Amino acid sequence: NFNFNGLTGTGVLTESNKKFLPFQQFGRDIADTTDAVRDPQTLEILDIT
């Protein structure tokens, strides 16, 4: 289970190579799920499966 910046869900957090634009927060998939998030404290692209 997790919360990032108030965003909540449950998934398997991994290292991911998808590349955000700096101001961004979430990633998302076609289905309006929350697919990928960026760790606030250490910026890194974390998948959510």
């Binding site: 909540t8 076609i30 289905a31 309006d32």
Partner: protein, 49 residues
């Protein structure tokens, strides 16, 4: 030999198949989007209600 030239550039001849694959993922998509709809309730997130 004519057959293989047709397929080489023909996207349409498979329209029958391509439609079937589409229409499923279509209704599959729409099925998913319905998880984001309020349906009259105050939110579409289960826990946030």
């Amino acid at each position: 030999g004519k057959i293989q030239d047709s397929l080489s550039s023909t996207a349409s001849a498979l329209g029958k198949l391509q439609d079937v694959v589409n229409q499923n993922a279509q209704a599959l998509n729409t099925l998913v989007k319905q998880l984001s709809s309020n349906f009259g309730a105050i939110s579409s997130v289960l826990n946030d209600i």
